[PDB]
Design a binder for this molecule. Structure first.
Ligand SMILES: Cc1cc2nc3c(=O)[nH]c(=O)nc-3n(C[C@H](O)[C@H](O)[C@H](O)COP(=O)(O)O)c2cc1C
Ligand SMILES: COc1ccccc1-c1ccc(NC(=O)/C(C#N)=C(/C)O)c(Cl)c1
Ligand SMILES: O=C(O)c1cc(=O)[nH]c(=O)[nH]1
Length: 361
């Protein structure tokens, strides 16, 4: 579980033996079987979204789409796990190959298209460990469930509403994912009037659940939005009392300077080239919501400095996925140790004190 050996030997060898989707499937299997080998200091604890989070570093959606590896992800050191996206009915997603690595850029491009076991399957899987999750949550290890919509659905809002009804009772927070670049028309749900109508319905459905099964609701947004789109989102989120934002999904942009041979593949780009575009989006959303709406910052986090930049820009919590595909499991403890060292070096009493700090200088 030594960073160097994973980084220099194990991951590169793995990457030479398997295609990227196979490597992801084996990583889920391995993690879920518990074949996995940092004690979190109090400075890392954060209280938000009606929960305690023992550390602010989560696994982003997409790695565990069907809720198979939740316990092995906490064992990896993540302070919170998000599963999904999950769609109402099962569906296979796009044809393969649909995942591409850009190792010269430390980036990935994927176009899975919401391959999902569906709500019923994920529901039974989570019910089999529901009381165990209740104790993990009370111990500072919460669970998010990210909701998507089926490719051929004719009523997007009813797909999310169904997600709320079936998985909301099993989640500490739900994510209305309206930012996949890999589902036709989906990102237009981020528009003001579509968004307000969609989220009104979601929140009415969430508020209809019994109090102990009533999750926070967050909206996950793209990094590709116009300034007008961001203003409209901020306004809707404040008008409706949305509980938080997840910022950001992958980018359909292809920044100048990408070197990987596969850079012109269709799909969302994740990893280092997305990092500052995501940080800047957090920074803007935090300012437009006056610091009053929790943000989970995600996009290109691969180190403590990456995490702290997003926290100082306005994130209460961060997630990563793509870094794990290059550095393997040791990157989790790495990010937490470096983040703790930087908070001390910069004078913060803990993560809480750093949240949004760039906006107060
Ligand atoms: C292979 C892959 C599949 C993904 N699937 C989803 C998904 O199902 N739902 C979602 O909201 N985000 C999904 N994401 C986006 C990640 O959750 C995250 O928003 C984005 O990758 C930026 O983080 P990163 O640079 O650390 O990977 C996926 C990302 C990747 C790499
Ligand atoms: C439990 O995961 C690992 C444990 C030990 C060593 C390597 C891994 C591992 C191996 C592969 C992956 N995933 C990928 O390589 C990948 C790509 N490309 C994606 C899309 O998940 C991940 Cl997330 C982790
Ligand atoms: O294709 C997917 O399933 C998917 C990819 C991605 O990058 N983001 C997302 O929200 N869904």
């Amino acid at each position: 579980g030594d960073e160097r050996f994973y980084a220099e030997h194990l991951m590169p060898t793995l990457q030479g033996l398997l295609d990227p989707e196979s490597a992801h499937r084996l990583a889920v299997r391995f993690t879920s079987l518990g074949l996995l080998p940092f004690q979190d200091s109090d400075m890392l604890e954060v209280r938000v979204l009606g929960h305690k989070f023992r550390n602010p570093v989560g696994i982003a959606a997409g790695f565990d789409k069907h809720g198979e590896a939740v316990d092995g992800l906490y064992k990896m050191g993540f302070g919170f796990v998000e599963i999904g996206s999950v769609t109402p009915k099962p569906q296979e997603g796009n044809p393969r190959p649909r995942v591409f690595r850009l190792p010269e850029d430390q980036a990935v491009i994927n176009r899975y298209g919401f391959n999902s076991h569906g709500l019923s399957v994920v529901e039974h899987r989570l019910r089999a460990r529901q009381q165990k999750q209740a104790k993990l949550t009370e111990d500072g290890l919460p669970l998010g469930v990210n909701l998507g919509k089926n490719k051929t659905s004719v009523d997007a809002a009813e797909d999310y509403a169904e997600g709320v009804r079936v998985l909301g009772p099993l989640a500490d927070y739900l994510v209305v994912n309206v930012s996949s670049p890999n589902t036709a028309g989906l990102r237009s749900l981020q528009g003001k009037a579509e968004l307000r109508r969609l989220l009104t319905k979601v929140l009415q459905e969430r508020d209809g659940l019994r109090r102990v099964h009533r999750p926070a609701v967050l909206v996950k947004i793209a990094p590709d939005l116009t300034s007008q789109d961001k203003e409209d989102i901020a306004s809707v989120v404040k008008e409706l009392g949305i509980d938080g934002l997840i910022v950001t999904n992958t980018t359909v942009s292809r920044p100048a300077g990408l070197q990987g041979a596969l850079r012109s593949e269709t799909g969302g780009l994740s990893g280092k080239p997305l990092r500052d575009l995501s940080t800047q989006t957090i920074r803007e959303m935090y300012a437009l919501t006056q610091g009053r709406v929790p943000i989970i910052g995600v996009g290109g986090v691969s180190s403590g400095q990456d995490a702290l930049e997003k926290i100082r820009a306005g994130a209460s919590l961060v997630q990563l996925y793509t870094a794990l595909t290059f550095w393997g499991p040791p990157v989790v403890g790495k990010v937490k140790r470096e983040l703790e060292a930087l908070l001390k070096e910069q004078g913060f009493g803990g993560v809480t004190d750093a949240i949004g700090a760039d906006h107060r200088r």
